[PDB]
Amino acid sequence: NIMRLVTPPLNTDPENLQLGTVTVLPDSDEAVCISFAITRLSMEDLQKVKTRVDNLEYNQA
């Protein structure tokens, strides 16, 4: 599709983990690579998220 409307293919296979998408420009050697891999969240990260939520509700108050 044209660059304004191009989208990556839609997939729902559980057996595969998506690491990212590669976009190729029309008739060119250049290509745009982006990583969208799902990454874990350790307990420290979740605690930091909880602290962020606490700050959010404090600011709301």
Partner: protein, 122 residues
């Protein structure tokens, strides 16, 4: 089974994408996937070194037809909307012929053919 039922598939680290453009083939673009670790379907997938992959170049064509623009005598140039143009199939515009010599046919009240068969006004 326990890992997938608890957390599903996820990445741990690595697996960054980088473009290199190695000239293994003119019809492909090389891409490098950096080393990393991940758990897919509950099974660990540890890769110590980067993996090279190649994508085919895009050559599929879109057709634009009846792209209209009003011609101005002051400015002769007219632009095309789609940028990566390959080839122009046809350009058509109204043209005026002045003083075209025509021979009268032998038959009376007959028909004399013009040099161009796309005429619409005398």
């Amino acid at each position: 089974e326990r890992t997938y039922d608890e957390s599903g598939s996820y990445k741990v680290n690595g697996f960054e994408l980088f473009s290199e453009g190695n000239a293994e083939d003119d019809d492909h673009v090389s891409v490098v996937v950096d080393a990393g670790k991940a758990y897919v379907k509950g099974f660990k997938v540890d890769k110590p070194v980067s993996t090279r992959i190649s994508v085919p170049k895009s050559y599929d064509l879109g057709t634009a037809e009846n792209e209209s623009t009003i011609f101005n005598k002051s400015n002769n140039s007219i632009s095309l909307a789609n940028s990566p143009v390959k080839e122009i199939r046809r350009v058509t515009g109204q043209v005026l012929i002045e003083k075209e010599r025509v021979t009268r046919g032998a038959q009376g009240d007959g028909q004399d053919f013009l040099s161009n068969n796309t005429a619409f006004e005398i």
